[PDB]
Every structure is written in C-alpha cells, then in structure tokens.
Write a protein that binds this ligand. Structure first.
Ligand SMILES: [Mg+2]
Lengths: 181, 16, 76, 459, 65, 121
C-alpha cells in the first residue's frame, strides 16, 4: 500500500482545566483577542510549552557545546523572525520569559485590528473570513495566520475586495438596481 | 583533469 | 503691545493672570480669555480667531525672551 | 519585390550611408547592436564641453512646473524606419510638461539654437470631478487634482500623465486629446512616477499605495502589480529590458524588479556617520531615497535627502561608491530672525554653531542610457555634470551649469547630429516649489520655467 | 489583459521538444482555456498549434494567477 | 546653553523621523504646536518632537515647560522642513506629538525612542 502520511495533534488539554484562575485567564484572553473557543488557547499553550521546554533543555547544556549553539541560534532566529522575540532580546534565557500573549498579538486578526483596517477584534475576524484582507499579493482567510515582521507592514485590503478597489458587493448593487427601478 | 564547463529563455506575450 | 495695544494687551496679561500663564494657553483658549470684554474685536469671527492666534504667537516672543524686541510683533 | 528584398534594399542603402559617412564600418555595426547587450557603450564624458554650453531659461505661466518628458525619434535597425508617428513628424523633437495647475503642454525643441516653442495644451479643472465617488468610476476625461508626472511613449503616438487624482490618462500626441482613462482603483493610489520601457509600449507606474503598476499602452490595459516596497515609491526608471528599478523614500531601500523572473533584488545604503568620522580620523544620515536613474542594465544611481549620490551594482547589495553632500550645505538661517532677542550674541547662540545646517536634497537625477555621464539637480542654483570611471567603480564632477535657478523637478537630455559629432541639449523643469509638496522655503530668484542648455562635442 | 510567461525552459532533444513552466496572469478573469493558451504559445514559439501541449494548470488561491 | 536643548544627532533624528512617519499612518500623530499644547494638557502624549530651526525658535519654548512640568520627554530636531515631510503633511511642521495608545501596532518602536530620548535629557 501507499506509505503512511504522518500527523500530530497541535493542542493538549491542560493538567486540571477547572481552575478558577485558569478559567478567568482564558476568559480574558478570548475576550481581548476574540478567540472562538478554548482549543485555540490550548493549541498556543502547547506550542509555547514545547518551545520553552526546548529552551530549558538547551540551557541545561554547557556553554559553547555544538548542539546548544546550533539549536539555540536556530530557535532565537525563528522567534525573532516571527516577531515574538525582539531584536535586542536574543538569548535563550529570554525565550524562557515569553508568554502566550506575544503569540496572540502576532495573530493576523490582532494585527488587522491594531493597524486600523478594523476597529475591533471581532470586526477584524469577520474581515479575514470574508476574503477582504491580503498579505502582500496573497489573500489570507485564516485568522490564526502568523504574521512575520516583514509581512506585518504589507497587510492591506485585497484588490478584489469592495473595500480594496473592486466593484460593490451584491448587496450594494442590488440596492442600487432596486432604487433605479 | 578538469570537468566540462557548465552551459532557452523566458518569453512573454500580452493579449486582450 | 505693538500687535494689539498697550491697554488691551495688558488686560489680556491680567486676564490670564501672568504673561507666563498666557503663553502656556492654547490659541483657542486665548481667544476666549478676551471674549468677555471683546478685546480681540461670520467674517468678523474669523479675523478675531485669526488675531487670537497671532496674539498667542506674540506673547510667546515676549515671555521666554530675556530682552524681547518689537521686530517680530511688528511683522506679525 | 518580396518583403525580404525590401529589407535588403533598406539595408543596402543603409550600408552605403555608413560608407559615405566613413574597420570603421564594422565597429559602427557593433555599436548599433550594443544596446541589446546591457553594457555601457557611450564613453563621451571627456569630449563634453561644459564651459562652452549655451544656457537659456524660458519662463512659463504655469505654477510649480512639476515634470517634463522628452520624445526623440530613433531609427529602428530591424525595419529601417523612423520612430516618428507620421511623415509630418519626421525628425521633430517634442517635449511634454505638466504642472500643479492641471495643465499639460507640449513644445517643439527641434531647433537647438532656438528656444522651446509651444504647440498645444490641455487644462483640467473642477469640471472633471467625478460625481460617483467610487474608485472604479473615476473615468473622467480630464484631471481634477495636481498632475505630478508625464511620460512619452517611445512610438511617439501617445503621452501619458498621472498625479494625485489617482488616474492614468493617456493622450494623443498630435492633439493632446484623451483616448483612455485608467483608474488605479485604490484609495491612496496616487501616481508618483512613470517610466516607459525603452523602445516598447510597456509602462511602469509607481503609486503612493506602495505598489508598482505595469501597463500596455497599445492594449490600454493593466498587466501586473508589484509588491514588496515598504514606503511610497517616489521614482521609477526603465531601460530596454524589463528590469526597472525603484526607490522607497523613507524605506531607504532601492529595489530592482526582474519582471520575467518574478523576483526582486533589495539594495540598502547602510552608512553611519560614526564609522565615517572614525575612518576620517559634516556627515548627515540618509533620511530617504527620492531619485533613481539606471545608468546601465547592470548599474544604477540614486539620490538621497542627505545630498548623497550613490553608485550601485547588481552584484553588490551595498553601494560601490558614494558622493556625499554633492550639492553642498543649505545656507545657515539668518541670526536676525532665529530669535527675538535684541542682543546679537544671544541670537548667534541659537544658531548653535553649525549643528542646524542641513544639506541640499537630490531632487532630480538623470543618466543618459548606456553612457558614462549623468546629471544631478537641486535648488542650489546649478546643474552638476558627473562622469563615471571607465571601470564603473567611481565618478567625478565633470562640470556645472549655473543657469538654472529653482527646484529642478525633472531633467531630460536629447541629442542631434551625426554619430561622430553629436550636440546634446539638456532640458530641466524648474519650479518654485518641490513637486511632491510645498515644504521647501521660497528660494530667492526662483522662477517657473524650462531650463535649456546645449553642449557640444569636440576634441 | 492576460499575460503568458514561460520559465525553467529546458530543451529535450531526446524527446525533441521544449519543456517549461507556464505562469498565466489573468486579472479580472476566472481563468484561460487550454485552447487559447495553446494558440498564444504556438504564436510565441513560432510553431504549429498541434505541436503545443499544456496541462496541469492550477489557479492559485485568491485568483488572478 | 542654547534655548533648543537637547538637540538630537543625525542618527537619533533619523530614528525619530522614522517613528513619526509610522505614527502618521496609524493616526497616532498630532501635528502643530497648538495640538502639542493640547495633548500635554490632556496627558495623552508620549513625547514631543520640535524643530530647532523654527522661525523664530522661541515660539515652541512653551512646549518644553509644559513637558518638564508633566514629565514628558522632549527633543529638538535640526530641520522643520524634514519634520513636516515625515509627518506626511505638505507644509513644514515645527512641533509634533505621539498620542498615547498601549494597543498600537508600533508600541515597541515608540518606547525604543522614548528610552533614548530620556537618556539624551
Ligand atoms: Mg471574491
């Protein structure tokens, strides 16, 4: 038969989900950043835990070991590129100091809200899912899209979108036709 | 002995 | 003094309470300091607002200068 | 009399002409095909005579003359027919100019001894404001906002203009009659620069919405939009091939676009006064790159707001050579007006010595295609001519022309005469204010007019 | 307007042909038929339509290419 | 000693003019001396940018006094014609302010300059 296609889970249930502090924290995160449900928070927590565990394991190693240098340099490069880690902040110890919030701001929905294309996180999500936002030349309809530093400042309304230059949507032209009639 | 030295271009048309 | 007059400008200084106080105020504020006695006076309102800024402009020349001159108030 | 025989006859006549003009014949034929090989082949900096240039200034009624574009017929070797649109226009030179007064004007510059002569003009106004308010409906015949730029099609059949009205209007050269209006279709898509691909109908448009738009004038349609610049693309240049180059203003990044390859090369200045001062043991940091002209298909030059003229090579990301404060330092502000203090010495301290001094901007910069000489412009009151080294690694100041007084919004060069003996005419648009906006303080003696300088070849 | 672009062109005398990747830019248009593209490629390459083949065309997400 | 003090160097001015341009696009920039006066009164400003070549200079020396009273960093740039160009307005600008917004997309860049400007003072 055909060779297997590997797969993996991108999230894990926290250790004891029902902590009142944890429930309030998820409430705050979801409200501030307009997350649909708790699975998004669990996913990003899983990713952050993986990253921070890797950073800890590398930190355990002595300074100047080949594996520590190579893996740490790669991890710092990726974190700096994605934008969670600032340029002046390039050390594994500071990787241990990251939080989920940083990745949350790096979401495309949050960037669209902050840039002023949308006045609210929910409005930003609605715009993303309706194909009105383009990163560079590419239309992106995934709110969980992770925006790089370079890609950050190319976010714009898509050329095909009515807000980005194209003809008015069906509602507008329907209303115009009925008014004409 | 030295190896052999290394050695069609894109073309464009617009219509309509 | 040269822009508006010795009597009128002095009232503005007293109305603000001090030449330092008057300089710190925004132009819109300076207009309503002298709006009770009609010191600075639709077309009429525009000149009053216009003069109010210049009055604010001239006051700054005076307050923060150790030896203010009248060259700027003249051209203003 | 088959068509091939016709080509023979023209070529046979063409070869006889070269023989009459004149080893020499073989070299000239190679020179005729030096253009396709994207390398400099016009080394005429030394034989220029700048001191003997006949300079003249012609006043124009329009306010703030924004740009100028010159059209020159060229004989096509492949078909041996002149680029002139019609027989009447055989060997006629035209120059098109735009201003902030919403007026397009064409002049005849054929007679180098004589001043430019107006032929026709078209003026826009509030009559052309679109009522719809929708971007796709901005298809009015005339302009209603400031026109910033103009470009002449190499075929001599159309002239295209653009500005803050976010429209691209293409006009008939003969009557300046609009034939097509192409909206940019973006809210902030204000056109800032146009460059025609040499000997082609392709047009490259730089818009304030951070994108470059490509058009086919023959089809009167848009082709592609280019993305990657991080700030407004103020300037655009183009040569025979499709490799156009741009500058990103505050981005301080110059980008070359390989349109066929859909790839782009990034170049950045990266100069720091601290290292510059140390290596020396006034140096101003680059703020923005405003002008660009491509000397060669593998080289280009850029001008910044710190008065820096930098030479670039496609191989190297960093500048290969730089000329700092090319046009000098701006006059120091007067002491009698810096402050209102009566005592003079108080006023002098406000000048803070020489710290407040700032350099001239390189408002205009043009290089003749595939040559070793280019011209720079500013409001210093003189045009400076620079010659590039034979190795294409450095350039020097060839000379200066002081006739121009005002902001040199754009520069153009035209040539006439025999191949060996060529007369060059330098046409530069002069305005009292910078093209993009009114930041610049009024310059004493500045006037709105077209500056003309005619330079000869002797040796 | 529609732009047709050929890249990664490899001459294959073993099969006596030209292999290449086709990029089609079609703003404001759904897509271009294989027939029309064969016409334009044939004209560009100065070869018979019958000698031109095209396949495996996928429209990129968001359209226009 | 000079009335315009501190005066930023070329490197600092470049970084400042970079931030102000970004703040202009994001609607976080108030332009004009009168605006800079108001924003200080409402306490919604991060720092005030000022032109040392302003004609005459004193006319914006009330902004430093309000700033030092309210503990707002302030700096002088050599050129007003340059400052206006960065702001995006078609006229020279002598004074400018950055509006307070912890939820702005350029918070890090603003604070980076807000650190250095403080060191300059
Ligand atoms: Mg759609």
């Amino acid at each position: 038969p055909r060779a297997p296609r590997t797969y993996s889970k991108t999230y894990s249930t926290p250790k004891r989900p029902y902590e009142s502090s944890r429930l309030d924290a998820e409430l705050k995160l979801a409200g501030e950043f307009g997350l649909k449900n708790k699975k998004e928070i669990y996913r990003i927590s899983f990713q952050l835990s993986k990253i921070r565990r890797a950073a800890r394991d590398l930190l355990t190693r002595d300074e100047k070991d080949p594996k520590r240098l190579f893996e740490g340099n790669a991890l710092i490069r990726r974190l700096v590129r994605v934008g969670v880690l600032s340029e002046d902040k390039k050390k594994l110890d500071y990787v241990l100091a990251l939080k989920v919030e940083d990745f949350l701001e790096r979401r495309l929905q949050t960037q669209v809200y902050k840039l002023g294309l949308a006045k609210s996180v929910h409005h930003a999500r609605v715009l993303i899912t309706q194909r009105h936002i383009a990163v560079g030349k590419q239309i992106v309809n995934i709110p969980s899209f992770m925006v790089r530093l370079d890609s950050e400042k190319h976010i714009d309304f898509a050329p095909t979108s009515p807000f980005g230059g194209a003809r008015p949507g069906r509602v507008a032209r329907r209303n115009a036709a009925r008014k004409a009639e | 002995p030295r190896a052999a030295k290394k050695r069609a271009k894109g073309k464009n048309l617009s219509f309509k | 003094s040269e822009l508006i007059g010795e009597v009128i400008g002095a009232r503005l200084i007293s109305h603000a309470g001090s030449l330092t106080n008057l300089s710190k105020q925004a132009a819109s504020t300076v207009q309503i300091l002298g709006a009770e006695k009609a010191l600075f006076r639709k077309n009429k309102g525009r000149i009053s607002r216009y003069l109010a800024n210049k009055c604010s402009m001239a006051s700054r020349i005076d307050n923060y200068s150790e030896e203010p001159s009248n060259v700027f108030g003249s051209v203003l | 009399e088959n068509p091939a025989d016709k080509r023979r006859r023209l070529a046979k006549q063409y070869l006889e002409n070269l023989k009459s003009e004149a080893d020499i014949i073989a070299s000239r034929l190679k020179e005729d095909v030096a253009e396709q090989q994207g390398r400099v082949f016009r080394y005429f900096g030394d034989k220029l005579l700048i001191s003997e240039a006949k300079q003249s200034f012609t006043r124009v009624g329009e306010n703030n003359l924004t740009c100028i574009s010159c059209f020159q017929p060229v004989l096509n070797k492949y078909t041996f027919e002149e680029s002139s649109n019609g027989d009447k226009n055989k060997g006629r030179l035209f120059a098109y100019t735009v201003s902030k007064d919403l007026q397009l004007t064409k002049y005849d510059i054929t007679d180098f001894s004589k001043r430019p002569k107006k032929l026709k003009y078209a003026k826009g106004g509030a009559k052309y404001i679109p009522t719809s308010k929708h971007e796709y409906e901005n298809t009015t015949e005339g302009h209603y906002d400031e026109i910033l730029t103009v470009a002449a099609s190499p075929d001599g059949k159309y002239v295209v203009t653009g500005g803050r009205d976010r429209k691209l209007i293409v006009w008939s050269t003969e009557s300046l009659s609009p034939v097509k209006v192409i909206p940019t279709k973006d809210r902030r898509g204000e056109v800032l620069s146009l460059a025609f691909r040499k000997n082609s109908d392709q047009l490259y448009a730089s818009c304030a919405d951070f994108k470059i738009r490509t058009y086919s004038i023959n089809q009167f349609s848009q082709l592609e939009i280019l993305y990657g610049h991080h700030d407004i693309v103020e300037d655009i240049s183009a040569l025979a091939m499709e490799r156009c180059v741009t500058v990103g203003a505050r981005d301080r990044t110059a980008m070359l676009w390989k349109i066929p390859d859909e790839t782009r090369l990034t170049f950045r200045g990266g100069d720091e006064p601290q290292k510059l001062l140390r290596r020396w043991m006034l140096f101003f940091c680059e703020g923005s790159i405003d002008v660009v002209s491509m000397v060669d298909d593998f080289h280009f030059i850029t001008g910044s707001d710190n008065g820096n003229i930098c030479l670039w090579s496609l191989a190297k990301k960093k500048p290969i050579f730089t000329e700092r404060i090319a046009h000098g330092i701006l006059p120091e502000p007067s002491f009698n007006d810096i402050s209102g203090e009566t005592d003079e010495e108080l006023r002098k301290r406000q000048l803070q010595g020489k710290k407040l001094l700032q350099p001239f901007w390189i408002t205009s910069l043009y290089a003749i295609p595939y040559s070793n000489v280019f011209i720079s412009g500013s409001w210093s009151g003189s045009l400076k001519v620079w010659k590039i080294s034979d190795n294409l690694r450095s350039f020097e100041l060839l000379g200066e022309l002081s006739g121009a007084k005002g902001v040199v919004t754009k520069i153009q060069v035209v040539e006439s005469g025999k191949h060996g003996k060529e007369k060059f005419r330098i046409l530069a648009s002069i305005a009292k204010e910078h093209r993009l906006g009114r930041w610049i303080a009024n310059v004493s003696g500045a006037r709105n007019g077209i500056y003309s300088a005619v330079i000869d070849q002797t040796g | 307007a529609v732009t047709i672009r050929t890249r990664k062109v490899i001459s294959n005398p073993l099969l006596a042909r030209k292999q290449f990747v086709v990029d089609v830019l079609h703003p404001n248009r759904a897509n271009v038929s294989k027939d029309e593209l064969r016409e334009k490629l044939a004209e560009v390459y100065k070869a018979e339509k019958d000698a031109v083949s095209v396949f495996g065309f996928r429209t990129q997400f968001g359209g226009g290419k | 000693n000079p009335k315009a003090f501190p005066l930023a160097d070329a490197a600092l001015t470049q970084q400042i003019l970079d931030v102000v341009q970004q703040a202009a696009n994001l609607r976080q920039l108030k332009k004009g001396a009168n605006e800079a006066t108001k924003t200080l009164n409402r306490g919604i400003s991060e720092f005030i940018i000022m032109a040392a070549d302003c004609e005459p200079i004193e006319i914006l020396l009330h902004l430093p006094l309000l700033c030092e009273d309210k503990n707002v960093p302030y700096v002088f740039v050599p050129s007003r014609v340059a400052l206006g160009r960065a702001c995006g307005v078609s006229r020279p600008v002598i004074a400018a302010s950055i509006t307070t917004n912890d939820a702005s997309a350029i918070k890090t860049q603003i604070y980076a300059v807000k650190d250095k400007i403080e060191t300059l003072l």
